[PDB]
Amino acid sequence: AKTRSSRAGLQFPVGRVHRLLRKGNYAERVGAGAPVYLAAVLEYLTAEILELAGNAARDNKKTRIIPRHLQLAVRNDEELNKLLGRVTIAQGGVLPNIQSVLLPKK
Amino acid sequence: AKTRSSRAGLQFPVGRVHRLLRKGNYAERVGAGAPVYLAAVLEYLTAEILELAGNAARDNKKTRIIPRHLQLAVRNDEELNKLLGRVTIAQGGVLPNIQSVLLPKK
Amino acid sequence: VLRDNIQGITKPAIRRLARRGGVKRISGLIYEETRGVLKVFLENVIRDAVTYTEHAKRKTVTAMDVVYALKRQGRTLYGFGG
Amino acid sequence: KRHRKVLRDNIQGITKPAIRRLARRGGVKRISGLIYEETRGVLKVFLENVIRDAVTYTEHAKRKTVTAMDVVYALKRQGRTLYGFGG
Amino acid sequence: PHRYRPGTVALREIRRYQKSTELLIRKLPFQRLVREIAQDFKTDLRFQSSAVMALQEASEAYLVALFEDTNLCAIHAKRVTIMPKDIQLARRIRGER
Amino acid sequence: PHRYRPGTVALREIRRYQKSTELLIRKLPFQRLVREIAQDFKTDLRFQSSAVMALQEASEAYLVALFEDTNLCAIHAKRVTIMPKDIQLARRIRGER
Amino acid sequence: KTRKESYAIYVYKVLKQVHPDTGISSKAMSIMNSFVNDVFERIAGEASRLAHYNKRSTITSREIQTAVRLLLPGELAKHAVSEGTKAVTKYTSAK
Amino acid sequence: KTRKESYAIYVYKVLKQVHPDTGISSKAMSIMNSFVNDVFERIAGEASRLAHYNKRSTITSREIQTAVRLLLPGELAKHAVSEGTKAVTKYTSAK
DNA sequence: ATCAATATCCACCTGCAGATACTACCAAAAGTGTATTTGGAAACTGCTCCATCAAAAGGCATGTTCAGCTGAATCAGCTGAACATGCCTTTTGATGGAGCAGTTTCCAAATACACTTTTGGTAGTATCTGCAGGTGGATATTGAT
DNA sequence: ATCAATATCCACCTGCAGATACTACCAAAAGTGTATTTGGAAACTGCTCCATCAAAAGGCATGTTCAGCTGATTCAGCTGAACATGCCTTTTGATGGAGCAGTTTCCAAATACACTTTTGGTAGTATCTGCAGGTGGATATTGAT
Ligand SMILES: [Mg+2]
């Protein structure tokens, strides 16, 4: 026996993905590649965020990723921000940002 | 020899609504009351809008409801306006409304 | 010292939120306005959550009840299940 | 087919007067001269987003013609549902 | 020699256009614009004429609503003249950015 | 005998709070408010601890972001002081009104 | 010459019921047809999700009911809920 | 008692490939898990819709692909599409 | 106020577009009836985890003081509305084919069912450590002068 | 400018909440081999309607003119920021019991299948009618004076 994930070179469960698709009433039937494709895509996106959130951890002199690191990762990247633009990350706070007219005069 | 519509006291078509529920893959199984209850709600809403649209037609001395009358109906009714707050009625126009400060003198 | 619960949402707490939001100076009338807005928010969300609860024949609002309410309100939240 | 006319600068068919009419329907009394370019921009973005999705549907269906339904489905994805054209 | 004061025709037009429902952008220009943008995404495409109409109905509806919001932004600023900054504030708040 | 100028502390707090992520409303008052509101929908209700939390997270996110837009509206009107009208304008443009 | 179905005759029946001397233009009917399809899809969707959330495989009139309360606003919901309840009750007792 | 599934370990596997010296809080993992479930639903949801529009009974990778295009922003979409077509190739050829 | 230029509102009419009509027909419906499968309510019950509350923590209601913001008043410069004017571009109505969409055959592919292997969630007990929270002292920032 | 009050910075230390590690375990997916059902590309062709040409209906571009709006300046006064801490509300932690969630049961209701009927669509050719768009004719609105 050899997992469909390992066949597809993926850390993400092709099996589970396949199942979840059937028991989702998304359609009558489900081709064999769809879960592979789908699972890749999820893996991919997970990596991207984990990368940037790690980098965010690094910047703040940390090795354990927390919510704040996911928030800084997501809202400092134009594309992730847009994909997650109607999502709230619990315990993420906000990007430091102050409108310039609110700064004291030089 | 009796339709389920007449059985339920409805103009809207229960058979049809049953059929469309199955093929839309909303769940494995569709209970017998569901298409009845839904067809009723559908009929209730379409009645409510036609009533109000009819009055707009009559308020304009017309006999044939056109899209402008549908729009006047929906937009003049708080609850239909919300239910359709992110929907556009082709050929409906907008409600007459000029902001105060824009009018003449003081 | 009899008092409405909405008023428990105090000036300083509201002031802090504003601050997180980048706000420097705040009209005194904001506090009542903000409470009004918060109350409408919670109503809309809670109404929907409870409706989920009642459907599940429960007497406890679960975090998933809230999460699902937020999702259909267009306010998807991450970190409490689902 | 022989020859196929080149499309360019059509954004400028969205004339000053037509934009002024839409402002009017929108209840606008006075319009700064810079509005027209800005509006052309905004419209161009709006169309690109809708047409991309519409055409994506077209291609997925392996068609060469964009249907009213492709546009209707695109409009729905983007939270701008339209009634009157089959959806 | 006779004249309306500035603002008087403008309100006249508001009442006129708020009362009707015809499309306010000329058909053909708008058609070309569609075809152009589409072509830039994909060549040798055709359009059902109702598909162009659907786009036009959507586009005009979108733009008319944007101008109400825009107008409100000017008025908030104690002006009666819409400017690009008003459109921009509307679109930021709307979440279009 | 040492006093800070108006708005120095305001700035200081902006920086502080933009940096942190703690919830800024006290747990208990909020919990009551939630329960009170739920009572008008159904009586004899109980709440998971995480459910109340989720509601708080969401409300504070919601309100923080509305203050951003609000602040933009005050600035639009050439002010630095948020007023109820700015909240109102933001909610109207967002399509909450 | 493939058969394109709509809710038009039903909308017309109901129209006659409420405004017996009033007609409806085909564009107006088109919008009416869109509106029914839309609300159907939106109720059926909420229903769908709701079932799933409760690990149910079946969509009953109870699911539709909650979907309605979730989807519609106050007073429309109250009345739509009557009419559906009424119709089911009357459906059950009619055999 | 009932087994509560999660993407957490797969997330964790991927974390290590990407940052082998970096860890992750519970709360952070929960968020990642929501994320995966969300995107899952969004993509499947769109794919479903596509099949239906096109009178098809099946969700094939073509549907997931078009779905991804429609949902993801420009560059993200491109990479995801490549990672997706990749994984399917690799999987087919593997015995 | 008065006059008058111009828009607006009726009312009445008339062609004709587009709507209601109807008779023929039919394929795809919905309905009816009988056979077989099972989902979920229903009922008992075990153990979280939720409300309650006492004790320990600590954030906020208070009123006073005044810096500095908001908004009213004023004004010049100039942008944008109105309009007259010349005519280019769109709109409207009538003739060729690319491609859509409807039928059918056929296998490559997904379903199903049952079986056999492993993986992933939990719990058990313990195992380990990143970092929040505290210290100290050096330096920056702000505000008074 | 200088001077000092206070906020902010960095380094180092330390206990433990919250992380990773672990093995049993077993149960429940996921994968493996066999038999079944079904979907949708390819091949073909009717035929809708899209692209593409010429004639008629009216909206667009452009320059001129000046009304009145915007945005700068100033300024008085009002209103929100900052401030000190005892005081009262929230937080932390301790403990019964509601209820949620796990499990098993059994039946009312749902799926399946197979004639049987009804109906909702279209198509062909006809037949009717609401109203849009023309006219002229009586009343409102607007702006000069
Ligand atoms: Mg081009």
Residue numbers in the entry:
A (entry chain G), B (entry chain C): 14 to 119
C (entry chain B): 21 to 102
D (entry chain F): 16 to 102
E (entry chain E), F (entry chain A): 38 to 134
G (entry chain D), H (entry chain H): 28 to 122
Quote what the paper states about this structure:
Although DNA has to our knowledge not been reported as an AUF target, we had previously discovered that certain metal-based compounds can form site-specific adducts on the histone proteins that package DNA into the basic repeating unit of chromatin, the nucleosome.
RAPTA-T generates adducts, via substitution of the chloride ligands, at two adjacent sites on the face of the nucleosome core where a preponderance of glutamate and aspartate residues from the histone H2A–H2B dimer form an ‘acidic patch'1415161718, known to be a key protein binding motif for chromatin regulation. The two RAPTA-T binding sites, RU1 and RU2, entail coordination of the ruthenium centre to the H2A E61 and E64 carboxylate groups (RU1) and the imidazole and carboxylate groups of H2B H106 and E102 (RU2). RAPTA-T adducts form on only one face of the nucleosome, meaning at a single H2A–H2B dimer, as a result of the symmetry-related (RU1′/RU2′) sites on the other H2A–H2B dimer being sterically blocked due to crystal contacts. In particular, the glutamate residues involved in coordinating RAPTA-T at the RU1 site are part of a seemingly ubiquitously employed nucleosome-recognition motif that binds one or more basic residues of nuclear proteins that interact with the acidic patch.
